[PDB]
Amino acid sequence: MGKLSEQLKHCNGILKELLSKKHAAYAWPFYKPVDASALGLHDYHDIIKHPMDLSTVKRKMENRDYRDAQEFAADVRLMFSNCYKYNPPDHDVVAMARKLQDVFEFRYAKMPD
Ligand SMILES: CC(=O)N1c2ccccc2N(Cc2ccccc2C(=O)O)C[C@@H]1C1CC1
């Protein structure tokens, strides 16, 4: 009934969409934590102090970690910012981040209030 719960439902709906087949062509790099060692990215954790990805956001939502929409949004945007920080701006993953963030921002803006 409460507004914070309603706003978190909206957040959970967004999260579901971001993880859906509809956006999978560009969302997939953000599905799981960056495995720096496996990708040979030995500077990743020197550059990115707070890694974030959609499975972590999903775990946090499932664990009732997010107390409000703003906290949820902060993690999703952190995930995109990390991508923009680490990768040169002309890399394919940055194009995919921008597209997925477009999905996120436009639906997030329809927050019930
Ligand atoms: C989330 C994130 O920033 N990353 C990411 C995360 C998980 C999986 C892949 C990636 N990609 C790689 C990648 C994406 C898309 C298309 C091709 C490639 C390619 O291999 O050239 C890059 C980057 C890595 C930080 C460099």
UniProtKB/Swiss-Prot annotation:
Compartments where located = Nucleus; Chromosome
Q: Where is the Bromo domain?
A: 2-111
Domain of life, per UniProt, equals Eukaryota
* Result after altering residue 39 to A: Reduced binding to histone H4 acetylated at 'Lys-12' (H4K12ac)
Protein task: Chromatin reader protein that specifically recognizes and binds histone H4 acetylated at 'Lys-5' and 'Lys-12' (H4K5ac and H4K12ac, respectively), thereby controlling gene expression and remodeling chromatin structures. Recruits transcription factors and coactivators to target gene sites, and activates RNA polymerase II machinery for transcriptional elongation.
* Subunit (UniProt): Homodimer. Interacts with E2F1. Interacts with (acetylated) STAT3; promoting STAT3 recruitment to chromatin. Interacts with CTCF; promoting BRD2 recruitment to chromatin. (Microbial infection) Interacts with herpes virus 8 protein LANA1.
Question: What does the UniProt entry state concerning the protein's domains?
Answer: The first bromo domain specifically recognizes histone H4 acetylated at 'Lys-12' (H4K12ac). It also specifically binds histone H4 acetyl-methylated at 'Lys-5' and 'Lys-12' (H4K5acme and H4K12acme, respectively). The second bromo domain recognizes and binds histone H4 acetylated at 'Lys-5' and 'Lys-12' (H4K5ac and H4K12ac, respectively).
Regarding protein family, the annotation reads: Belongs to the BET family.
Additional notes on this entry: Some specific inhibitors of BRD2 that prevent binding to acetylated histone are promising therapeutic molecules for the treatment of cancers or inflammatory diseases. ABBV-744, a small molecule, has been tested on tumors with success: ABBV-744 antiproliferative activity is mainly restricted to cell lines of acute myeloid leukaemia and prostate cancer and is able to displace BRD4 from chromatin. GSK046 (iBET-BD2), which specifically inhibits the second bromo domain, is a promising therapeutic small molecule for the treatment of inflammatory and autoimmune diseases.
Q: This chain belongs to which protein, by name?
A: Bromodomain-containing protein 2
Organism for this UniProt entry: Homo sapiens
- Name the gene: BRD2
Please indicate which part of the intact protein appears here, giving the first and last residue numbers and the full length: 344 to 455 of 801
